[PDB]
């Protein structure tokens, strides 16, 4: 009966790996070259995952592309937290298997505060008793959670489609939690969780772009496609031309 939820699980990506020299003593330059590799791989995986989404083929192929490029980091950060939650129970950061982040790597990467934030969201998963089905469904909602204020090439469709993903999230909660101030209690937190992802993303958007600019001066390598997105679409978000849709203000 869970037609929507079959799909989401059915289309779930594999455990992507970075290919990081775990035998080499840590260094900013080494660390961030694997995280850029990681980004670039996961991006591909996001692309294929996203195209299978129910009603995604509905969007105009530019919107299809745009929502991917805009929402791409937040998705990486969401799933990531679930990975560190379910693999390392939230003690470290399960980026990929070959790239798990301890405290000293967190600091050595120069994204410490930013990771502080992400280990929190990892902790949120447990604290809030997030279900696997609750995760997947929140995860899907996130591709539809960041519009350009400029206007999408076909907004109407996007809006219909988004409004539906919320129904589906409702339905996942309203299922086994039969009660008024329960479904209500839950949704709040979940939307309150989903919103909290955005600040993390924009921070990583700032670090990335920054690193990208000063990359000539650090020995850190941006994949052909990493670096186009970070230059072409990220500055849109950072310049405020693209904003996240928030549940609360």
């Amino acid at each position: 009966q869970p037609i929507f939820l079959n799909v989401l699980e059915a289309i779930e990506p594999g455990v992507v790996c970075a290919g990081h020299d775990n035998n080499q003593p840590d260094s900013f330059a080494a660390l961030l070259s694997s995280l850029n590799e990681l980004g670039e791989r996961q991006l591909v995986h996001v692309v294929k995952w996203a195209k299978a989404l129910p009603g995604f083929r509905n969007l105009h192929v530019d919107d299809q592309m745009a929502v991917i490029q805009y929402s791409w980091m937040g998705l990486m950060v969401f799933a990531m937290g679930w990975r560190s939650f379910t693999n390392v129970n939230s003690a470290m950061l399960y980026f990929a298997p070959d790239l798990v982040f301890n405290e000293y790597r967190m600091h050595k990467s120069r994204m410490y505060s930013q990771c502080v934030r992400m280990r929190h969201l990892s902790q949120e998963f447990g604290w809030l008793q997030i279900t696997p089905q609750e995760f997947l469904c929140m995860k899907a909602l996130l591709l539809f959670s960041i519009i350009p204020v400029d206007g999408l090439k076909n907004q109407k469709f996007f809006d219909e489609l988004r409004m539906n993903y919320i129904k589906e999230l409702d339905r996942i909660i309203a299922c086994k939690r039969k009660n008024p101030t329960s479904c209500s209690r839950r949704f709040y937190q979940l939307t309150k969780l989903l919103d909290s992802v955005q600040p993390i993303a924009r921070e990583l958007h700032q670090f990335a772009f920054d690193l990208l600019i000063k990359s000539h001066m650090v020995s850190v390598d941006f994949p052909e496609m990493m670096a186009e997105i970070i230059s072409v679409q990220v500055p849109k978000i950072l310049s405020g031309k693209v904003k996240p849709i928030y549940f609360h203000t």
Binding site: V47, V61, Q64, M65, I68, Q69, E224, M225, E228, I229, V232
Partner: peptide, 8 residues
């Protein structure tokens, strides 16, 4: 772009 042309 590089994304748009890998995408389609």
């Amino acid at each position: 772009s590089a994304f748009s042309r890998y995408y389609t």
